[PDB]
Amino acid sequence: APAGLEVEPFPIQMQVILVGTPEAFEGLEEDPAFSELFRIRAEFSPTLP
């Protein structure tokens, strides 16, 4: 790109909801910023009664 628009930082109003397997997150839980950004852990039980 010969030039680029200087986009001003924008406040985030969305609520991101990550989805993944426990293995897909244990490789992402090692980042403290992940644990500080994503506080709510919604675990699906593998087996229902």
Place this chain on the structure above:
Amino acid sequence: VSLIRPGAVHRAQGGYLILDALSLKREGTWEAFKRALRNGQVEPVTEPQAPAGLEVEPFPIQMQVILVGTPEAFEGLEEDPAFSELFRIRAEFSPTLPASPENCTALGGWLLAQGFQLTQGGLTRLYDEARRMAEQRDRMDARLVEIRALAEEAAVLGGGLLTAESVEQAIAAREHRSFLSEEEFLRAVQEGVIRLRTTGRAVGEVNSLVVVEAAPYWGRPARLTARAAPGRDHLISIDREAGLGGQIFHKAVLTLAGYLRSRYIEHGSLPVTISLAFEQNYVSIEGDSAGLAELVAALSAIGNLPLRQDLAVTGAVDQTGKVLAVGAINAKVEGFFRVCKALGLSGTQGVILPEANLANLTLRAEVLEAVRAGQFHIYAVETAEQALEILAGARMEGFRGLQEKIRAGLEAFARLEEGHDKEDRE
């Protein structure tokens, strides 16, 4: 000259430039940054396709850069002598602040500054939770954003007011949101898949306490079995021989092996071989927190001493027979209480923990209520002698003593090897 865009360094002139150690050692701009610092070489970067580039004359740097990062973020950057010569001032944040009423008042003022609404009870509960995070009764956790996140959770659970009940609700919800693993473990224990005994007395079996990894650490008992057989001294760690035990686990095993070797001397080398295994382990073991449990289990196996299965035993031990402090004692005690409650509290189940961890015992409300009601006990010891006295329900010194029984068991094992040698020679 009209197409150069100022960077962070250019607008940091006369002031301060805050940077993160991760964003430097990760994006590879650390070398360029330290050359811009030492030599004043700030070069507006250009794409390689550029047909030409302005020759930017080196600029003396007037800003004061203040790197921010974790100790791990800087130990990977301290190896450069240019860093140690450029950044002389080290501003270390203590992980834990002292637990003082002034500190609690400061925390409350900080929370009120954020926009929260604290009641006195809510502030008290938040301060107690901060003390619990630090795992110290006299220190409170300094991670203010963790407390702020808990405050936000309690605020949305209490409508906007941080009541003590609201904070307790937030704590319980946070515990329950990560309770699936412990719930499954409890179900497995109830079904008999993971056989644990929270009642009765079994020889050589001890409910060791184990803390799992992953999101908030849950303690859970792990049955430990020690079996004593005649043979030349070989205290076998089955979890280490199989390769599951870590370095510190092997260190603990060797430490208690040396204690056993040097404690019983009225024969030659230790005339028994002891096999130590975590039943239903199937996972790598790391750390030295089951040293006391291993030692008491081995002693019971040697002396044929039935150990009260209702008491879980934690704590490291040195090779002179003294219980050593361990980490995450709250998780261990609460996990054993959880398992005991799931099986139904017998009114005598308890946890044997090092005397040195009393300052770390910040137990939850339910565990404390159980202790007050007498439905759950917490024993504190400093030597393994006391721990085995509690488990076996007897005294080492004195006739029909635990020490006498262990000596008799070692004597019997030695005489059995002796009879085998007698048959070999005759």
Place this chain on the structure above:
Amino acid sequence: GGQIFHKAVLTLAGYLRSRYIEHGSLPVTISLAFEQNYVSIEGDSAGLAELVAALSAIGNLPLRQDLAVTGAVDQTGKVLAVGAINAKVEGFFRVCKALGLSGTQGVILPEANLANLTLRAEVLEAVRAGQFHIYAVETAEQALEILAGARMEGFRGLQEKIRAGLEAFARLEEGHDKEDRE
């Protein structure tokens, strides 16, 4: 053999060491091999099978080959739960049916796995007809009693024969020593 397989082997070795004490160290050496294996082994599912096979070898106990044995064991001699019990039972039933059901073939599985026994229709029909059995045990003592078809305790029991076999092995070793010294 993997890490957990070695853990199981060591566990049952310790159980054998501590179970039989009327000599010095265990006077026998036991060789355990999966025949036609040729593949890496992982897991602790055959601890009970290994233990009963070792006990039979020690005591010269003929084990009923019609019964397949699964289940882990701890070093106090108690059968522990195992995974994929349905697959194990159905596979043994498949092999028995391929060779023709004898009316006595069965599977010895941990008592702790009863909540996991969700067998297929054909296996359940075979059990109902008596053409296939499912034994549940919690200690290896029961599994050996079932396999050898005798009662552990008692006169002419399995325990007496295992003790006699260990005594014979120690007798032969000390006879070798007697020759060495004279």
Place this chain on the structure above:
Amino acid sequence: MRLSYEALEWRTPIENSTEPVSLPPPPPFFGQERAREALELAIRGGFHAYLVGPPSLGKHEALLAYLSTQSVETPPDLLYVPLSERKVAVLTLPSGQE
């Protein structure tokens, strides 16, 4: 020996769970007087400092607030001057002269 409940009760007693507290904002780096002193020395001496602490502790927010509390002489208006069609240098001038 068995620990009594009082020997185990660690929670600070609650006077009342009502009457919203009114407390003044604490000073930046409260309870972190070591880091505050180090950073004060860095600001006074014009050195380069680095903030070390366990992750998620508020180092960035506390440091930004404290630096906002600080004050300094008005920074000169720096700018780029073309020494030639090829050569440019950063020229610093007193504020307003730009």
Place this chain on the structure above:
Amino acid sequence: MRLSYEALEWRTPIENSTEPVSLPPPPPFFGQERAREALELAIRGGFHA
């Protein structure tokens, strides 16, 4: 001891293999009340889950 067939029969008995069932749709995250509660908390509080 040998397990009887009744002690091994796990299948739920069938009332009839006909008469197509008519059942109302279950609530989302049925049997996953933990995840439902966590996600409700995230929606109410505007967090990232």
